[PDB]
Amino acid sequence: DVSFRLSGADPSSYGMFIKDLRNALPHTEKVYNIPLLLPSVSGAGRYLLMHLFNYDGNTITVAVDVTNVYIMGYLALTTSYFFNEPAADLASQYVFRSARRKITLPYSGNYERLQIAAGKPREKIPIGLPALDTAISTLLHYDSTAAAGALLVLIQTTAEAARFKYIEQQIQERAYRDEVPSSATISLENSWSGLSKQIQLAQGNNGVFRTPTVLVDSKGNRVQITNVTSNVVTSNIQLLLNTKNI
Numbered sequence: 001d002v003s004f005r006l007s008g009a010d011p012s013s014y015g016m017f018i019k020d021l022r023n024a025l026p027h028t029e030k031v032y033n034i035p036l037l038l039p040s041v042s043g044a045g046r047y048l049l050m051h052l053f054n055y056d057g058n059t060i061t062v063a064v065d066v067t068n069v070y071i072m073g074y075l076a077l078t079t080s081y082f083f084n085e086p087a088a089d090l091a092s093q094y095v096f097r098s099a100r101r102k103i104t105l106p107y108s109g110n111y112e113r114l115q116i117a118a119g120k121p122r123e124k125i126p127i128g129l130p131a132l133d134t135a136i137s138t139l140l141h142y143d144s145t146a147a148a149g150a151l152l153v154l155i156q157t158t159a160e161a162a163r164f165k166y167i168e169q170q171i172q173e174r175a176y177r178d179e180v181p182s183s184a185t186i187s188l189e190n191s192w193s194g195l196s197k198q199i200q201l202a203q204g205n206n207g208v209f210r211t212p213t214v215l216v217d218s219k220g221n222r223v224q225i226t227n228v229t230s231n232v233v234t235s236n237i238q239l240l241l242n243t244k245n246i
């Protein structure tokens with residue numbers, strides 16, 4: 001398992017958490033020095049438990065699929081909550097079984113559905129460590145509309161930060177003040193599958209992407225990433241979604 005406590009949290013302790021999160025995900029191979037997530041894992045081993053504590057020390061446990069870093073569901077006191085999707089229902093067979101009741105959330109975990117439930121796109125939702133404290137607090141007591149927004153914050157401040165060093169750094173900048181994600185942040189989130197694919201396709205293509213990936217950079221400018229020498233590949237991305245799952 002991995003843990004993170006908002007009480008006394010700073011950019012350093014958050015960095016240690018994201019490091020732990022990455023290191024908890026198994027791999028047998030690196031592609032261009034980036035860990036390649038496994039095609040599949042059977043049984044309970046598929047799910048990582050993240051213990052998150054709000055400033056007041058109240059806690060939720062979040063179940064994460066270690067093959068794609070997708071959040072499946074979470075436990076809050078004696079109630080488990082899972083996304084309305086087949087992968088999450090499968091997860092509910094293995095994690096939080098001792099919960100007194102299980103609620104299936106009225107949406108899947110994908111960004112489009114969460115934004116619909118939350119009533120706003122995540123371009124408009126501030127993120128940061130204070131926002132994560134709020135998210136944990138919200139998830140402690142069921143409120144599906146509020147939970148959608150909280151989960152958008154949760155996913156970006158954990159999974160997306162694990163996937164991209166840039167995103168980790170953006171959250172570190174928001175340690176004591178929330179701010180909506182940069183356009184570059186949104187771009188990287190939306191491009192993770194594509195980038196993972198092209199980095200793997202480059203393996204037998206002399207480091208060249210079969211299809212270029214369009215990204216927005218730190219200056220709001222639209223760049224085109226075409227091979228593994230790009231900083232996004234050498235610097236930024238920390239985990240690759242296996243092409244078998246794409």
Ligand SMILES: Nc1ccn([C@@H]2O[C@H](COP(=O)(O)O)[C@@H](O)[C@H]2O)c(=O)n1
Binds near residue numbers: 083088109110112189
């Ligand atoms: N169970 C799920 C499903 C999706 N997600 C996140 O939501 C995204 C899906 O968004 P779209 O369907 O809008 O592409 C994924 O990239 C993933 O990071 C998640 O964190 N947990």
Ligand SMILES: *[C@@H]1O[C@H](CO)[C@@H](O)[C@H](O)[C@H]1NC(C)=O
Binds near residue numbers: 225226229231
């Ligand atoms: C590869 O990407 C680098 C970095 O963006 C770029 O400068 C260069 O033009 C590209 N080279 C090839 C052969 O695609």
